[PDB]
């Protein structure tokens, strides 16, 4: 079936972290928190919270975008849970 004109939401996550209520409350103005991902790692391209692609950051005429390098494989989907 080609019911396919539907629009979808695309998001890009720079990084993720796990951290507790105390550190949340201790965060103040100008507080910086390091991300789990090491710098230069391909970011995560999510669709409604679902990952299909990985890619690095890029700027296209002052506009944000990602250069995708891997999109489809569920083989490591067991790992990222």
């Amino acid at each position: 079936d080609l019911i396919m004109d539907i629009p979808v939401k695309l998001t890009v996550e720079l990084g993720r972290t796990r951290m507790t209520i105390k550190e949340l409350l201790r965060l103040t103005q100008g507080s910086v928190v390091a991300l789990d991902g090491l710098a230069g790692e391909p970011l995560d391209i999510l669709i409604n919270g679902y990952l299909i692609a990985q890619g690095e950051v890029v700027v296209v005429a002052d506009k944000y975008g990602v250069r995708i390098t891997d999109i489809i494989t569920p083989s490591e989907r067991m790992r990222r849970l």
């Binding site: 690095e56 950051v57 890029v58 700027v59 296209v60 005429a61 002052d62 944000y64 250069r67």
Partner: peptide, 14 residues
Amino acid sequence: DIRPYDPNTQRRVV
């Protein structure tokens, strides 16, 4: 215009 974005590139055009 296809250049890789890098941090500390404060191209703040206001």
